[PDB]
Amino acid sequence: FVTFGWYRLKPGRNNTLAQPRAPMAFGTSSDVEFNCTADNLAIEGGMSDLPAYKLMCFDIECKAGGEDELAFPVAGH
Amino acid sequence: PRVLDEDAPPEKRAGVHDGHLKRAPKVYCGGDERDVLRVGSGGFWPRRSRLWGGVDHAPAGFNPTVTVFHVYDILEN
């Protein structure tokens, strides 16, 4: 097992499977969710490529709105 | 800011407004307008979310099979 890499669901210890959670029991904001144990998982070596993951690259701009509008912004104000 | 209210005398322009207001937050994308927190069908920014506050906004019959899944982060809870 690795912290960053492809994986794969397996048949499991006896035949136990990944048990797909029901859309209401989702803990995360994900599309599909599962309930495995460590034996329903396989590393799936051979794949390397990176999935379709998204990158947000944000940048805020702030204004200072006090008596001195040349002062630098402060979040508490 | 008070300068955002364009038709108002030059001396109600400095400073900011403040204080509680009672309407769902809207977003104006060009000529259109929408509630910020309203997923619905249309949208002014993309969405990869399935649930939104309990409602399931996926096309019915969503049930993607999962046999391989890149993993990028691991939580514990």
From TrEMBL, chain A:
Functional description taken from the UniProt entry: Replicates viral genomic DNA. The replication complex is composed of six viral proteins: the DNA polymerase, processivity factor, primase, primase-associated factor, helicase, and ssDNA-binding protein. Additionally, the polymerase contains an intrinsic ribonuclease H (RNase H) activity that specifically degrades RNA/DNA heteroduplexes or duplex DNA substrates in the 5' to 3' direction. Therefore, it can catalyze the excision of the RNA primers that initiate the synthesis of Okazaki fragments at a replication fork during viral DNA replication.
Subunit structure: Forms a complex with the ssDNA-binding protein UL29, the DNA polymerase processivity factor, and the alkaline exonuclease. Interacts with the putative helicase-primase complex subunit UL8; this interaction may coordinate leading and lagging strand DNA synthesis at the replication fork.
Residues reported to bind Mg(2+) 3: D59
Domain of life: Viruses
Protein name per Swiss-Prot or TrEMBL: DNA polymerase
Residues involved in Mg(2+) 2 binding: D59
Residues reported to bind Mg(2+) 1: D59
